[PDB]
Amino acid sequence: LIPTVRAYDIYSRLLKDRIIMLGSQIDDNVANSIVSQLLFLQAQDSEKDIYLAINSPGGSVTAGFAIYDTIQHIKPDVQTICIGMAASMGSFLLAAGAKGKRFALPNAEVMIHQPLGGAQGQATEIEIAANHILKTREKLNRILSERTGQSIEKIQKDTDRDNFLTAEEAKEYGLIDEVMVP
Amino acid sequence: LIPTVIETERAYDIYSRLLKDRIIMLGSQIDDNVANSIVSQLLFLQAQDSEKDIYLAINSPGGSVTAGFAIYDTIQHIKPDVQTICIGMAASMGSFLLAAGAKGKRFALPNAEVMIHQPLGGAQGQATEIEIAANHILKTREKLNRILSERTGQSIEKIQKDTDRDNFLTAEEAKEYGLIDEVMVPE
Amino acid sequence: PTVIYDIYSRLLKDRIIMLGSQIDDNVANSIVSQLLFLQAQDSEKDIYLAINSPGGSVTAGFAIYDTIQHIKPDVQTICIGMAASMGSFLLAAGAKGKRFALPNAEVMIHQPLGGAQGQATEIEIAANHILKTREKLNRILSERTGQSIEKIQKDTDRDNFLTAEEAKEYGLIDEVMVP
Amino acid sequence: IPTVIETTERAYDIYSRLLKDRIIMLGSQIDDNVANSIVSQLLFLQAQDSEKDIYLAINSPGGSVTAGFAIYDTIQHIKPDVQTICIGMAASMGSFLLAAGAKGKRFALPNAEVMIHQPLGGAQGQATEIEIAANHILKTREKLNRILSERTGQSIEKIQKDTDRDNFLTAEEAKEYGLIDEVMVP
Amino acid sequence: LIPTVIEERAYDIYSRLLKDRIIMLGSQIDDNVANSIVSQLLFLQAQDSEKDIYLAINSPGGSVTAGFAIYDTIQHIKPDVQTICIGMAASMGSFLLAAGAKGKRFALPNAEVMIHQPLGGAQGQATEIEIAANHILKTREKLNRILSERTGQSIEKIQKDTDRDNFLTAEEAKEYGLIDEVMVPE
Amino acid sequence: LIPTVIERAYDIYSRLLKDRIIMLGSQIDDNVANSIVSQLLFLQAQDSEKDIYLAINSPGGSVTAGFAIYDTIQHIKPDVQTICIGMAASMGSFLLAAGAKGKRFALPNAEVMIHQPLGGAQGQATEIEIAANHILKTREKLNRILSERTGQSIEKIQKDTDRDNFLTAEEAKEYGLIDEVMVPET
Amino acid sequence: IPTVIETERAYDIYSRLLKDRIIMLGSQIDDNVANSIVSQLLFLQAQDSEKDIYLAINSPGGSVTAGFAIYDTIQHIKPDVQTICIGMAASMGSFLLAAGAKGKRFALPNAEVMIHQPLGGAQGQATEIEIAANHILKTREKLNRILSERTGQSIEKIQKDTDRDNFLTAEEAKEYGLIDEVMVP
Amino acid sequence: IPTVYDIYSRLLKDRIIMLGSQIDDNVANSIVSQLLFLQAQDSEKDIYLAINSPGGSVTAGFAIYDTIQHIKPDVQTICIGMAASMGSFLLAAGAKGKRFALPNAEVMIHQPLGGAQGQATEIEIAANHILKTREKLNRILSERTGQSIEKIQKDTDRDNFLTAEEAKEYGLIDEVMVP
Amino acid sequence: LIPTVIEERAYDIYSRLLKDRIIMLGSQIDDNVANSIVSQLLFLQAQDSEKDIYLAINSPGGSVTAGFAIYDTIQHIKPDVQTICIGMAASMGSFLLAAGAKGKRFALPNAEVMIHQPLGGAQGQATEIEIAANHILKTREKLNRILSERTGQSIEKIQKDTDRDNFLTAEEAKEYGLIDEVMVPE
Amino acid sequence: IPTVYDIYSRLLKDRIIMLGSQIDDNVANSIVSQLLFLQAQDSEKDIYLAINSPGGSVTAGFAIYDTIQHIKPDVQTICIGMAASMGSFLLAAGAKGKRFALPNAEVMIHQPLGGAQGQATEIEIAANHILKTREKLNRILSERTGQSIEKIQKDTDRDNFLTAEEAKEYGLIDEVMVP
Amino acid sequence: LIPTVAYDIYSRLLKDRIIMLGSQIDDNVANSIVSQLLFLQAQDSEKDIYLAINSPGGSVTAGFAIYDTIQHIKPDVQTICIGMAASMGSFLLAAGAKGKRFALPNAEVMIHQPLGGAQGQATEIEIAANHILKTREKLNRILSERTGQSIEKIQKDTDRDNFLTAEEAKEYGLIDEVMVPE
């Protein structure tokens, strides 16, 4: 069910007020849509804040970077608000919001972990794939270090396995700035 | 779900709204359907205004070489400059299209990934059928490499070497290679 | 893209038809309808048929071919990407002097494909039919290209890939559209 | 399927736009859904104008005999002449419908294919069930052949012979046979 | 895709026919189809309680209970419901054909009518199978009693004539009492 | 395909809803219940005094979904008439019996079936015990309400629902599941 | 399937019964089963052309042509073949039960016998369907003529009585003429 | 399955038959063959039929039942584990005074199961057949247990699980074999 | 499961019959079956080049080339091969039946013989389909020529009579020349 | 499985039975047959039942259990690897003083598992049956371990894993076989 | 195991130096035939061996295992086509001892080019194409040697499926004689 509110579906109605809902796994389709919404909102008003609500298990790293770079590229501040869960690339995007404007609701879940992938074929193909995913992890960890204030060494350790954080723990970690208390 | 934007009684999905501002989003694998749509958008934008730049945003793992060439040739055919901007990833035919943008107007965002490699395909049947298919994909690779050489300034020999296996480049490396002109740094 | 025109409908307003998929009866029905609609809108102005197709059904292709020849407007054909099999036949079917390909477009010609199962006499009927279909295709291609039927038969025995320039030399198109 | 807009903004898919001009496209296998649509279009066109011709373009491999007879009987029932035009292929029940158009107004384009053959079916179960199914399909064939005899001018005996196996006809052969009246030459 | 007709307002072709009090029953009968047909019948009665309704039938039949939802709605409403078989009316479809207003049940000349006993199934314990058997037998008795009333044939004859699939031409269906007239073309 | 009526465009069910008619024509699941509940609440908001008409052709379904509908009927101020067309089985018959007193109807050939609830349980012995106790309590709840609405004893309802029990419309009236059989005007 | 040893000769239980001229027909009849049963019948005739053979039947039936391979072999060989229905003999199984030596067709008291018309199928062109229909009807005629000969019932009665599944008790099968005696314990 | 002979063959040498699976035609054919073989070996010595079975085909079960009654040796029945449905029927069919269960063995009785699809008259035939089959089963069970047909009908309407001691009280067995 | 016979050598029943020069062809003909039958024929010739061999046939036919492996082996070896149809000999099975030694081709009285044209398939390019068609037509000519030689019927008659499935009784097969005698029981 | 006899048959010659799989009717048939065979060979000598089993059918398990109690020889039980659910029940069922586990063997006890579908009254019958089966299992386990029924009920509510030493303390075995 | 004379009809024929090649050629079949050929040579290095062929062909490398074993061993290997010898089957037919290659009168012989496949990168497809083309050259050269036909003629005659009667196969040089029945 997606209700209608001239007619607008609920999400289009929120977009009118500069709210973007990232409420699914991140793939290229989702990233296309979010990027397009960000660019549209900048064109409508280059100064007013944008609000990106996040309830996502993560997904494609490259798709996530399409969103991440668009956020950093545009002029408006993008606030991030975790509702429900932000895992993997979802937590990376949560951490990518405007400094001081990254939030989670009190019972929201944040999870961080290393990237996942695969490789099949010849030894040299497997080597190329391994080197690529390792370089991707280095890139993710370096940016997370910059955005959280944690050292790269600590991020590497803390993302070796699935690491679940409460909203308060995410604030302490530097993934968000504030827990939005009711 | 793709949201709608309304301007005053006229409803647009957001892609249609961006197209109004001469932005085309290439955000999927390249197949004939995708190429049809992108070609049609390019031709429509030229008809609307033959002088103003067009912006082609690219986040694509690549896909069909012939579908990619439909887009490539349409870019070169039309009068407006087509800027290319890599966001996320441009791999295989996607990186070829990135490199095909107007000279000086090929960009990537800082964390975007570019990957170049040789074409993929298949052949089944009689020996002579396999021969025909092999000759065809080899000729297609020669065509791709020659154009990439022209667009990057790298020699055909170097391109052949560098595309033998998957070759991942950062945005800065893609600039150094000649696949793009600038990394778009955030203000 | 879409305004509640889709972009194809917007191009059709300017007499451009996009043939961008495998040819089956559904696709042929749409293209035929578009051709008839454009003739009804204006019987004198050219129509532009852009072709990026791996081919498909011969009978569906002939629905398009015969509709092109039937209507009054010239139909220009423009190969973008690929025109293979029945797609290359339709490319070759455009108005004389108004058949084009973009420089990196691929053209492929080959004999028809089909199948037959059942009794020997059923298989015989099916074989005779596909052979007669091939003769029909080759005769028309000979007329449209200026190549002999013998040459077309030989050149289509196996998949035969041509560059845009080669397709021009062959007579399948009139010009390569250089940018 | 593209859209056409005629502004005073009213939107039509391509087929709806042709229907406005009394052209019906029969461009698929004939099943009940297709027949229901075509019958509805015919009845609608008669209600809009009971005198003006209707044009039924046919590119079809055939299909259900009963669905085909729904179309056939509707054509014969309504006041307007229904022209038939074969584009691409008219096979089996498709060729039957081609032959069913108004006398003098059955056409094929030059490279169109016409195929005629006997009805196909199946039966499973008890011997007496198989007998019932066999008698039914044989009666259906006699009905089809009798009508085709009437519409072509060929004898029933000749039609029976000529539909025993798949029989492919060129547009010119279909004219000579009496399945169409004219080949539409460009 | 069903085409659209524009008059300022857009209609799919079935909605356009409904405006003229024509209902198309063109598929297998299940609860969804019955819901739609019942709703259309009630809507047409509300629009005009006196004017005839036309129910066109091209259906292989289907659910007996869904068919009875349609049957009882026909009898309940005030307008006469004409029935017209186009293509085929089999099993519950032929039962509905026979259920039209007396004197206003029709078939086109090549339409197929088939009558046969109800079909069903039962699995489980012997007592469960017994309950299922008694139910389908009582359902058959109900169908046959109504068909006897609507056709003028005896229940004994209907029982015999529906033991196996029984295919009737339009003319035979008239002789049987399932319809009143064959609609011959002008 | 569900047709449209233009007055504003309405699908046929929306058009009936404008006249306070709700069609329950499928298996009862949460989606269906959610829709019916929403329709009942909407109709009460439009007019808290005028009757609502709930037509029922349903094989039943989810007991909890059925209770969402049942409790909404009892909660709202308007009387809800129930009318069985085709079949009301299991939770469908429960809802039929839940209509306003004196305003529960069936058409003459409609079927009503009552039986005990169905379910399942897998896992540990203590999990199976919990599931069994739950379904037994659910059956007690259903039977108690059916006793209240029919006037039959709980003992009799228990016995009569042990297996599938099919009732004619007249039998359903005699049983107290409905108030009247709607006979057609001749 | 257990083994029996006589001392060193090992037999599965069916082979051990075959040594005593008992053939088990205990499955659906298809070409494989018929080929085995036919081979057993011919082997037994070769071993002793005069001694009775015992064909125990517990079968739902199956292929008519496979059944006729068995039927014609029974009639062809010299030894009398006794038939004994244990459990069920349905369709072609009941036909084979009825085909045993006159006076030597038996059923156990609670055994089930069922008779019905042949089943089949046909797909394709109208003329192909006609050929298939004519063939199955002729096959039914053949079956009914033989059953009439073996039971003493008229062809028309057999036709009527096989129109649908017709279950018979052992006593009813005796009254019908499908067997000669119920083997009482 | 170990070798000594496989173990079942070794037990058969001592006139023990193991019925340890669902009853289908294959199982019945084997058990019937074993019974006939044992009678041929010695027409006077008892046979022992051990039963651990969820039941299965009624006609396959009756092949076994009638063979037991037909042969001269007494057939003792011994329920180990479970005898359900046709398995409990066969347990009850052993020689009078020689039907046993081990103390923790489970006996279950219930009505026959089946199915029917097709025309109303086909469904009627199938229903009449399974009802007659149930009457037959109940009549024989009544004879073998001493319970009335009415009681058997009531008691088998649903799954009815019995302990060994309850099965003895019911008349399905004669003794519980205490260790 | 195939029984064993012990004489001290153990034999499956087929091996026991083979000892008496009987070969059982009781399945569809494929390369595996043909390998086995050919091997059995060659073995029997080696054991005794003069004594007759008996080939019992109950087969729906199968691969033509596999059938020709058997056919040519029959003709190649020194012993006469008697053929006996039990049950059915269809298609390549009937061809093998007709291939037995002259005067020693039999059918049991209720055995079925069926003759028809070869079946096959072809997919791919037009020229591939042509090659496949020419091959199957050449194969049919070869089959018909041999059947003419073995039956005494003309090739023209065989062509006509095998156009569709043609079922023959044992007596009809004798009249046709496919067998020499119907083996009547004593 | 190597040959010496296959090795299981070799071990059976020395009165060792290997229960090394899930318990179903086939496995129970075999084990019961082996037990009866060993008793027939020698009614006084001990039998050794090695157990590595995740459990399985309760009725099949009771076929084995009752056969053990029925026969005259003592049956030693030895857990190697794992004895879970019905496997641990059989381990506990060995001759008093002759139940063993190897030091790293795992024992697990838990309540029986099952299912039920259909009408409320059918679900009730199935629930009552499995609850009665649990009562039966727990009563016997109480007798064989010396633990109260209340404690067994508590301790089997969820999967309860025991070391060999814990199983000895619990009374499921008598000794841990130390090397 | 088809009939016994445990000891099976094929084993009985092998006792008389007859090998039956009656299936598609794969590694399992080749391994068996090669083993049979080596066994027969060990039993008697002078007496002829008889290889009956009814085969649609199969693996080219498996076929060459058989081919090279035939040429390696000392006994002459007679080949006899019964039913069909197609593709690698016809190659093996042609490989029998000179003067001792036979077909029965209605047997079918078919020759055609090798079949295969390739997927992956352009350079991988090239390697696969070059390999199958070289394999065809090898097959054609040997067939030329064994038939007396030119390589050019073999190339042309195998471009598509080419069906030969037994008499045509003799004329072609694939066999020496058609075994006519007495």
The tokens 């040299």 sit on which residue?
A124
Contact indicator for K89, K56 with CB cutoff of 8 Å: yes
Element (H, E) at I85: strand I81-90
Give the HSE-up count for residue D134: Cα atoms under 13 Å, Cβ half-sphere: 22
Contact indicator for J17, J50 with CB cutoff of 8 Å: yes
Residue J169: exposure state from Cβ atoms within 10 A (0-12, 13-18, ≥19): exposed
Contact indicator for D98, C52 with CB cutoff of 8 Å: no
Count chain H–chain J contacts defined by CB atoms under 8 A: 90
Q: Do I183 and G73 touch (CB under 8 A)?
A: no
A73 Cα to chain B: minimum distance (Å)? 5
Residue G154: CB atoms within 10 A of its CB come to: 11
Helix pair angle (J58-70, J25-41), 10° resolution: 10
CA-based Rg of chain H, rounded to a whole angstrom? 17
> Quick one: three-class SS letters along chain J?
CCECCEHHHHHHHCCEEEECCCECHHHHHHHHHHHHHHHHHCCCCCEEEEEEECCECHHHHHHHHHHHHHCCCCEEEEEEEEEECHHHHHHHCCCCCCEEECCCCEEEECCCEEEEEEEHHHHHHHHHHHHHHHHHHHHHHHHHHCCCHHHHHHHCCCCEEEEHHHHHHHCCCCEECCC
Return phi, psi of residue B10, to 5°.
-130, 115
Give the HSE-up count for residue A111: Cα atoms under 13 Å, Cβ half-sphere: 17
Spatial CA neighbour of A49 closest among A78, A27, A90: A78
Q: Do J59 and H3 touch (CB under 8 A)?
A: no
Show Cβ contacts of residue A128 under 8 Å, excluding neighbours closer than 6 positions: A119, B165, B166, B168
> What distance in Å separates the CA atoms of residue H52 and residue H67, rounded to the nearest whole number?
19
CA-based Rg of chain E, rounded to a whole angstrom? 17
- Quick one: tokens of I52? 């007759």
Contact indicator for F20, F51 with CB cutoff of 8 Å: yes
Helices and strands counted in chain E (H then E): 7, 10
Instruction: Find, in chain K, the residue whose alpha carbon is nearest to that of B130.
Output: K129
> What distance in Å separates the CA atoms of residue I155 and residue I138, rounded to the nearest whole number?
14
Contact indicator for A65, A52 with CB cutoff of 8 Å: no
The one catalytic residue among G27, G63, G116, G148 = G116
**Pairing state of beta strands F9-11 and F4-6?**
antiparallel
Residue I74: exposure state from Cβ atoms within 10 A (0-12, 13-18, ≥19): buried
* Residues on B contacting A at a C-beta cutoff of 8 Å: 1-6, 9, 14-15, 17-18, 21, 23, 25, 27-28, 57, 59-61, 87-89, 109-113, 165-166, 168, 184, 186-187
The alpha helices in chain K, defined as continuous H runs, are 9-15, 27-43, 60-72, 88-94, 122-147, 151-157, 166-172
Show Cβ contacts of residue F1 under 8 Å, excluding neighbours closer than 6 positions: E2, E12, E14
- Quick one: tokens of F4? 């449209």
Contact indicator for I11, I5 with CB cutoff of 8 Å: yes
Residues composing chain B: 187
What residues pair up with K165 in beta bridges, in sequence order? K108
Residues composing chain G: 185
Q: In D52-76, which positions are buried (b, 16+ CB within 10 angstroms) versus exposed (e)?
A: eebbbbbbbbbbbbbbbbbbbbbbb
Contact indicator for H19, H51 with CB cutoff of 8 Å: yes
G-chain CB neighbours of D131 within 8 Å are 133, 136-137
- Quick one: tokens of E79? 């307008």
Show Cβ contacts of residue A172 under 8 Å, excluding neighbours closer than 6 positions: none
What residues pair up with C31 in beta bridges, in sequence order? none
* Residues on I contacting G at a C-beta cutoff of 8 Å: 1-6, 8, 10, 13-14, 16-17, 20, 22, 24, 26-27, 56, 58-60, 86-88, 108-112, 164-165, 167, 183, 185-186
Among I118, I129, I140, select the one facing C127 at the smallest CB separation: I129
Q: How many domains does chain F have?
A: 1
Q: Long-range contacts of range I161-164, CB-CB < 8 Å, 24 or more positions apart?
A: I161/I115, I162/I115, I162/I116, I162/I117, I163/C121, I163/I117, I164/G127, I164/G128, I164/G131, I164/I116
DSSP code for F28: B
K11 Cα to chain B: minimum distance (Å)? 37
> What distance in Å separates the CA atoms of residue K174 and residue F17, rounded to the nearest whole number?
84
Among C108, C109, C121, pick the best mutation site for testing chain I contact (most I Cβ within 10 A): C121
Contact indicator for C60, D88 with CB cutoff of 8 Å: yes
Element (H, E) at F95: helix F91-97
> What distance in Å separates the CA atoms of residue D98 and residue K165, rounded to the nearest whole number?
47
> What distance in Å separates the CA atoms of residue G82 and residue K7, rounded to the nearest whole number?
35
> What distance in Å separates the CA atoms of residue J9 and residue J6, rounded to the nearest whole number?
5
Return phi, psi of residue I95, to 5°.
-60, -45
Contact indicator for B119, B140 with CB cutoff of 8 Å: yes
> What distance in Å separates the CA atoms of residue A22 and residue A97, rounded to the nearest whole number?
13
Helix (H, G, I), strand (E, B) or coil at B57: strand
Among H108, H111, H119, pick the best mutation site for testing chain E contact (most E Cβ within 10 A): H119
Which CATH number is K88's domain given?
3.90.226.10
Q: Do D127 and G136 touch (CB under 8 A)?
A: yes
Q: Do I165 and G132 touch (CB under 8 A)?
A: yes
Question: Which amino acid belongs to residue I77?
Answer: I
Say whether E91 is catalytic: yes
> Quick one: three-class SS letters along chain A?
CCCECCCCEHHHHHHHCCEEEECCCECHHHHHHHHHHHHHHHHHCCCCCEEEEEEECCECHHHHHHHHHHHHHCCCCEEEEEEEEEECHHHHHHHCCCCCCEEECCCCEEEECCCCCCCCCCHHHHHHHHHHHHHHHHHHHHHHHHHHCCCHHHHHHHCCCCEEEEHHHHHHHCCCCEECCC
Question: Which amino acid belongs to residue F81?
Answer: Q
Chains in touch with H (≥3 Cβ pairs < 8 A): E, G, J
Domain span at residue A23 reads: 1-182
Beta strands in H61-121 (DSSP E): 75-84, 99-101, 106-109, 113-119
G-chain CB neighbours of D133 within 8 Å are 122, 129, 133
H-chain CB neighbours of G20 within 8 Å are 40
- Quick one: tokens of F140? 């007690």
Contact indicator for J45, J73 with CB cutoff of 8 Å: yes
What residues pair up with C60 in beta bridges, in sequence order? none
Contact indicator for E129, E136 with CB cutoff of 8 Å: no
Nearest-5° angle of CA B32, CA B38, CA B43?
120
Residue I181: CB atoms within 10 A of its CB come to: 12
A32 Cα to chain B: minimum distance (Å)? 6
Nearest-5° angle of CA B55, CA B59, CA B61?
135
Helix (H, G, I), strand (E, B) or coil at K115: strand
Helix (H, G, I), strand (E, B) or coil at C173: coil
Resolution (Å units)? 1.8
> Quick one: three-class SS letters along I59-70?
ECCECHHHHHHH
Spatial CA neighbour of I114 closest among I85, I94, I128: I94
Nearest-5° angle of CA H83, CA H85, CA H89?
75
Q: Do G167 and H132 touch (CB under 8 A)?
A: yes
Residue D43: CB atoms within 10 A of its CB come to: 22
Say whether E116 is catalytic: yes
> What distance in Å separates the CA atoms of residue D18 and residue C36, rounded to the nearest whole number?
9
Contact indicator for D184, D110 with CB cutoff of 8 Å: yes
- Quick one: tokens of B50? 């033959």
> What distance in Å separates the CA atoms of residue F74 and residue F86, rounded to the nearest whole number?
24
Nearest-5° angle of CA F86, CA F90, CA F96?
60
Q: Do G183 and H69 touch (CB under 8 A)?
A: no
Helix (H, G, I), strand (E, B) or coil at B6: strand
C-alpha torsion sign, points F15, F21, F27, F32: positive
- Quick one: tokens of E131? 């309950």
Give the HSE-up count for residue C157: Cα atoms under 13 Å, Cβ half-sphere: 8
C-alpha torsion sign, points J101, J103, J104, J106: positive
Cα E124 to Cα F124, G112, H114, I76: the distances in Å are 26, 21, 6, 61
Among D40, D67, D72, select the one facing E14 at the smallest CB separation: D40
The alpha helices in chain I, defined as continuous H runs, are 13-19, 31-47, 64-76, 92-98, 126-151, 155-161, 170-176
Largest CA distance in chain E: 62
Instruction: Find, in chain K, the residue whose alpha carbon is nearest to that of I41.
Output: K9
Contact indicator for C11, C29 with CB cutoff of 8 Å: no
